[PDB]
Design a binder for this molecule. Structure first.
Ligand SMILES: Nc1nc(=O)c2nc(CNc3ccc(C(=O)N[C@@H](CCC(=O)O)C(=O)O)cc3)cnc2[nH]1
Ligand SMILES: Nc1nc(=O)c2nc(CNc3ccc(C(=O)N[C@@H](CCC(=O)O)C(=O)O)cc3)cnc2[nH]1
Lengths: 182, 182
């Protein structure tokens, strides 16, 4: 189980339901690579996200391509147009991937939001890594990413495929971080 | 939604978890054919059965070839070696079935028993057909097919792919029947 998130200096990840920061072409690009790139011969990655997050993807981008899309909602009666699956909980979503037939099609599981879901998963017993983009500048948000327990998670000063120096796009700096827990 | 079964004159469907009658080659062929034949190429039929039914099939025929095998168990920790899916209830399996990614891989749904599964499936609301083979002899049995609500089901005097004549194998006579509920 991987988690991916981009967070401003103040830990906000959302605002009015949109990104608290202007679009970062390269950043979005990195999220496309990480969640798409399957380590295995002919397997696909599964992406799990709550309702608000599905809805925050430009319609013409739905469902995220090259990946299986799963929507968590204790509420929707049927899966939003374009989504692959609906689960009511995270636990039920994780279970489903343990189904023989699914197991052999899915490679990496990525949790891409939102807040309550990051919350649930970060707590989740087990081996988990967090891919965090630190957007070094203050943005006004209404939704925040949780504190990262530094008892439990460790930063990997190096990571196959992840750049190490500070990126800048539209006078906005940010670096890619990878934390692990076992 | 389809149910298929073979039944004695005394409505027996099993003994010491075996078939009450000697094996009928050609009746087996028919079960095989109907459960196997999909109207759509690139789609498979899904077979649902209770645990006792799973284990009742010769380890060599498990899972039933050319079909997705779904096991129903309240108990079971994980899915038995060879199953494709495991569900807790019929309602849960049907729900699995409406998942979009699953929806486009499966054509027809066949319920293969045991008497519990049959029963639950029988009253399930909707369009339902029952494919019943009446073996024209009494056989000692411990398991029994529920009775068909004639207030609800209607025998169709005909059906494509289903031979109308009284069949015989090894001195035993049997006939194929088709019942529908709307
Ligand atoms: N690093 C990181 N960056 C993000 O932008 C991000 N966004 C979410 C949630 N929101 C979204 C919203 C839109 C799209 C999206 O349109 N994705 C497409 C376009 C990628 C591109 O244009 O480069 C995709 O194909 O991945 C993805 C995630 C979760 N984790 C993130 N994590
Ligand atoms: N009409 C009907 N006849 C049955 O024998 C039957 N059996 C079950 C449950 N038990 C079983 C036990 C073994 C196999 C089985 O071995 N099937 C194989 C072989 C068929 C053949 O060899 O011709 C298969 O490929 O279906 C199937 C169902 C449920 N509905 C039935 N329904």
């Amino acid at each position: 189980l991987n988690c991916i998130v981009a967070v401003s200096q103040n830990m906000g990840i959302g605002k009015n339901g949109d990104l608290p920061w202007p679009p970062l072409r390269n950043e979005f690009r990195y999220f496309q690579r990480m969640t798409t790139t399957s380590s295995v011969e002919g397997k696909q990655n599964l992406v799990i996200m709550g309702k608000k997050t599905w809805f925050s993807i430009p319609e013409k981008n739905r469902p995220l391509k090259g990946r299986i899309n799963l929507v968590l909602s204790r509420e929707l009666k049927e899966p939003p147009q374009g989504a692959h699956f609906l689960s009511r909980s995270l636990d039920d979503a994780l279970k489903l991937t343990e189904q023989p037939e699914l197991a052999n099609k899915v490679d990496m599981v990525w949790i891409v939001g939102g807040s309550s879901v990051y919350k649930e998963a970060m707590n989740h017993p087990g081996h988990l890594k967090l891919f965090v983009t630190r957007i070094m500048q203050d943005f006004e948000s209404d939704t925040f990413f949780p504190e990262i327990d530094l008892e439990k998670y460790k930063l990997l000063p190096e990571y196959p495929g992840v750049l190490s120096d500070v990126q800048e796009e539209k006078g906005i700096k940010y670096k890619f971080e990878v934390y692990e827990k076992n």
